[PDB]
Amino acid sequence: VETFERNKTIFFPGDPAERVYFLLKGAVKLSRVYEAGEEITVALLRENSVFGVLSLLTGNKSDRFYHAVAFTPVELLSAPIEQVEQALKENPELSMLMLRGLSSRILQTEMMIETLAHRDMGSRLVSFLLILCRDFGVPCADGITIDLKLSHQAIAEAIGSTRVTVTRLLGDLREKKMISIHKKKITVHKPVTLSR
DNA sequence: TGCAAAAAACGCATATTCTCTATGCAAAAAACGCATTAATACGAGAATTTTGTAGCTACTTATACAAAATTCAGGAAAATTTTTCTGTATAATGGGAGCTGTCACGGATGCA
């Protein structure tokens, strides 16, 4: 079942990602692209949604122009336009799910979309951490734990910080012990805290 | 089977007369004018007022030292398999396997 780790290349320029990526699990992201570039988690998929997104544009040869990779050993299918094909033509069985797919990944980002559009990025970080680091693990070191080990330059890549939102922002959070270098727990003791 | 010929029909004498072509009536449409009212637009007033421009200020980042806390490449033991070397003590005493049906040529020797 289609199952992808980090440090990869999943979409490309031009992809045929039509026949389903069919993402089932990750805790992770659609990096996108286009020309100016920014292959950013310009969407996401954790466990519980599914691709089939620009794969369902003009379809198997649209102008499919993204590129994504994980940090999770993503989980995602072993079939072609069949399980979807049911889902597409023969009914709304997983047709509503097809629509849901967009409303479960595009619209998922849509929320982060009206929120990533803020001045300081710390907000986007706190939001992101409010949903993920908190929930699907236990708020360990100093509170709503980073729910994994990543990097302090994570922000430096997530949003593309320039060794600036790093040590400075970290500094602030080091001052309010809402951080934990150890196993990258880095976090407020309480979810509401930085969520204000 | 030639007509001469008669009576009734079928053709030159008008009543009838009745579709017929022909003007004045009349009734209600219509449209034109008296026109009235109201509404569509001009005049003034000062009110909001957004945009356009300056300086201050907060965020954001350009950059210069380097061993962060972690990755990796050899170095040198084992660990087990495998490899090479050395050794095991009655008697044992000359080796099989086809060539024998090709025609013709060119030296090269042996053999009296």
Curated annotation (Swiss-Prot):
InterPro entries: cNMP-bd_dom, cNMP-bd_dom_sf, Env_Response_Regulators, HTH_CRP, RmlC-like_jellyroll, Tscrpt_reg_HTH_Crp-type_CS, Tscrpt_reg_NtcA, WH-like_DNA-bd_sf
Signal peptide extent: none
Keyword Phosphoprotein listed: no
GO cellular component terms, semicolon-separated: cytosol
PROSITE patterns referenced in this protein's UniProt entry, alphabetically: CNMP_BINDING_3, HTH_CRP_1, HTH_CRP_2
HTH crp-type domain location: 119-192
Record bears the keyword Transcription regulation: yes
The entry's keywords: Activator, DNA-binding, Transcription, Transcription regulation
Known DNA-binding region: 152-171
Pfam families: cNMP_binding, HTH_Crp_2
GO molecular function terms noted in the UniProt entry: DNA binding; DNA-binding transcription factor activity
Domain of life according to the entry: Bacteria
Reported function: Required for full expression of proteins subject to ammonium repression. Transcriptional activator of genes subject to nitrogen control.
Protein name: Global nitrogen regulator
